[PDB]
UniProtKB/Swiss-Prot annotation, chains A, B, C, D, E:
The gene is ctxB. Its main location: secreted. The holotoxin (choleragen) consists of a pentameric ring of B subunits whose central pore is occupied by the A subunit. The A subunit contains two chains, A1 and A2, linked by a disulfide bridge. One of its GO terms (molecular function) is toxin activity. Keywords: Disulfide bond, Enterotoxin, Host cell membrane, Host membrane, Membrane, Secreted, Signal, Toxin, Virulence. This is Cholera enterotoxin subunit B.
Amino acid sequence: TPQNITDLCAEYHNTQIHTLNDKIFSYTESLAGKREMAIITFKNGATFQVEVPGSQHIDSQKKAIERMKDTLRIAYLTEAKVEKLCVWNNKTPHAIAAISMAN
Amino acid sequence: TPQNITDLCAEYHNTQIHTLNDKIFSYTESLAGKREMAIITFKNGATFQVEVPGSQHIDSQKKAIERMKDTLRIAYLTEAKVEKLCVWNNKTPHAIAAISMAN
Amino acid sequence: TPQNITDLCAEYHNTQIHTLNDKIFSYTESLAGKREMAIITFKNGATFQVEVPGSQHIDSQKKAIERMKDTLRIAYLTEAKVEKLCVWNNKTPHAIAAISMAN
Amino acid sequence: TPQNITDLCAEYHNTQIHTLNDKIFSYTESLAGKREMAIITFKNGATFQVEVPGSQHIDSQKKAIERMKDTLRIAYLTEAKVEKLCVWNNKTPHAIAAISMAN
Amino acid sequence: TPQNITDLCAEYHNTQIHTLNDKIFSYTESLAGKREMAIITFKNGATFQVEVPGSQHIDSQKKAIERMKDTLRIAYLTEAKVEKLCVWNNKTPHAIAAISMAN
């Protein structure tokens, strides 16, 4: 299996790594229908989403999506530095696939 | 694919943004039958609910309602500053659709 | 819907408000069969339970009972001030229906 | 309903109370097959488990087993003083039935 | 039942203990399809995974895998010292079977 987020990210099409090395600036979450999603920003203006669960997701991703929103909330509240995000870049805002935290 | 809470809120009928820029003053939650809900207030008196789950909600909103109560509770306990709430204004108290946190 | 815990509590028979304005002094929880419950106390000695789920609970209350035990545990560990409890007084210990927290 | 952990403990066969009045010294958790369990120790060497869910457990206990493991982990991480444990003493390590925490 | 992680680990083939006595240096998690996993590293370079749930896992392990990722996340964020990991060393990175925290 992959040993780091960059190698993991590269197993997929339409992805890229963003390097942030910064805490999350804002955390937004919605329960409105068809927009049950989270959005984060950084102070540089960079904006990312956790997508609404949909037909593009296989069943094993469903729990992991819920976990990622849990992770972003507590990272935001603890001011944890985000190192990198692996994102799909065929969505706007780019859609989070993976996160690494260090330092 | 909204990039922020204001653009997300605009997608729905009967909504408005409240700008708080303040921590939650009180957090209330109930397990009483038919009132399985949360209520928050701010020191300015503004009061908001997370509605009891009902037929006005589609299935995908159910998990998101539970997450929102989780979010309000930890926001309260950590004294996190709430930036904005998107709410439905055809309920009293106004009903939360989305939350943003930022300092 | 209710604006606050007092109005909510008044919707139910056999309830009363206890005003504590204090942190939880002790937190007890059990996984023993037929006693899957939590008990809290306050410094003055007053004792309260989250009841074992039973036939008196409608289905929607089950998730809320689990949430309430989560809330009590974190409130205890963070030394959060409990403002009020709405309780059923036809049980001993009195059974928690709702909680408000405020400083 | 029992008022405290000691009275709760007394309702079961093969139980005893341990009075620790100490934080948890170590926390161990396993996802290995047939050993999906947690083990804790105290400085005095006393060791306790949350048992693997099994046919000795009724359905209502399943959620409470999961909650107990959640409680032990966060108690460990926050250095929360554990007052008493009610345990089944017909297992080794003794198997946790209930926990109380007080300052 | 085992009294500690070393004895637990020794019940399984293809395992070893690693003694770290250090906090986690980095935490990575993924919701990408077929790579719903977590990876942690230590400052010495040691790298470990929580494997993607698969056919090698029995049903009882599923909840425990989710719990373990919860544990690693919070251990990372709180800088909790990890004492030992029990791992399967027939996978690269080595796959976590159990964790102990002390000190």
